[PDB]
Amino acid sequence: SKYIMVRGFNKSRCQRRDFSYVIDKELLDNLKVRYDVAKYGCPLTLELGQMFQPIVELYDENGFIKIVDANFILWEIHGRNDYTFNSTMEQNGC
Amino acid sequence: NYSNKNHIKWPMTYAGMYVYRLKILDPNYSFCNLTTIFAIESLGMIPRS
Amino acid sequence: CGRDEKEYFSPCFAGCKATKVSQTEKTYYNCSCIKEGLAASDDEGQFIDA
Ligand SMILES: *[C@@H]1O[C@H](CO)[C@@H](O[C@@H]2O[C@H](CO)[C@@H](O[C@@H]3O[C@H](CO)[C@@H](O)[C@H](O)[C@@H]3O)[C@H](O)[C@H]2NC(C)=O)[C@H](O)[C@H]1NC(C)=O
Numbered sequence: 165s166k167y168i169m170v171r172g173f174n175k176s177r178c179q180r181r182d183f184s185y186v187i188d189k190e191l192l193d194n195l196k197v198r199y200d201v202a203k204y205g206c207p208l209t210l211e212l213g214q215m216f217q218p219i220v221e222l223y224d225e226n227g228f229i230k231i232v233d234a235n236f237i238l239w240e241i242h243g244r245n246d247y248t249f250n251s252t253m254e255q256n257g258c
Numbered sequence: 259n260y261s262n263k264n265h266i267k268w269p270m271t272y273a274g275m276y277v278y279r280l281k282i283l284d285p286n287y288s289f290c291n292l293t294t295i296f297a298i299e300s301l302g303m304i305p306r307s
Numbered sequence: 308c309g310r311d312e313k314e315y316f317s318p319c320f321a322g323c324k325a326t327k328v329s330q331t332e333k334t335y336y337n338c339s340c341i342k343e344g345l346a347a348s349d350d351e352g353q354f355i356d357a
């Protein structure tokens with residue numbers, strides 16, 4: 165009954181619908197992608213210059229207990245290479 | 259991770275739609291695999307020459 | 308115009324069963340006879356429309 169949720173998202177608080185789109189050459193051919201609110205749930209619109217860090221929150225059965233401080237990895241499901249992380253290895257330290 | 263300095267960016271050439279999966283990586287944090295899915299829509303516009 | 312960049316004639320033939328018109332533009336809603344199209348689309352007071 166304990167899970168994580170990225171801060172600032174509602175499973176069905178907002179409503180829209182089903183969509184279809186085609187993405188080419190940003191992948192890892194032309195594969196059709198179907199977006200449904202049922203699973204992915206909400207769409208956040210980020211401006212041209214905006215950056216985002218998805219801070220995650222730990223939820224117990226009845227409420228959120230703490231903010232996860234552990235390392236987490238992020239990757240879009242379909243397979244692309246265009247997204248990048250602004251910090252480098254040295255700035256983090258390695 | 260939280261309190262880290264890194265934020266994911268996207269190209270500014272065009273507006274794009276991505277659906278992301280996130281997974282906790284710390285081996286000694288919890289027993290079964292914590293995972294979530296969200297989505298980000300970008301907004302790059304290319305200027306007229 | 309649909310969001311697939313495909314050009315549809317007769318904006319009402321696009322299946323748009325609703326149309327909210329703003330001060331500076333005309334837009335059509337519930338556009339049924341459209342094909343999937345609609346990759347990112349957009350709007351504010353309403354969502355998705357041609
Ligand atoms: C990757 O991009 C983000 C921006 O979205 C950078 O986070 C921002 O980092 C700057 C400094 O590098 C912060 O500016 C200043 O931070 C000090 C910290 O004490 C604060 O006192 C100042 O008032 C000012 O805000 C900025 O706050 C921070 N962004 C947020 C939302 O807090 C990040 O540093 C970039 N990566 C690297 C490796 O720099």
Ligand SMILES: *[C@@H]1O[C@H](CO)[C@@H](O[C@@H]2O[C@H](CO)[C@@H](O)[C@H](O)[C@H]2NC(C)=O)[C@H](O)[C@H]1NC(C)=O
Binds near residue numbers: 324336
């Ligand atoms: C046509 O568009 C309207 C809004 O632009 C949609 O509005 C819904 O209409 C139904 C009527 O069957 C109401 O029960 C809902 O409450 C309305 N929604 C909202 C948010 O008010 C309508 O769904 C669209 N038509 C179709 C067939 O989907």
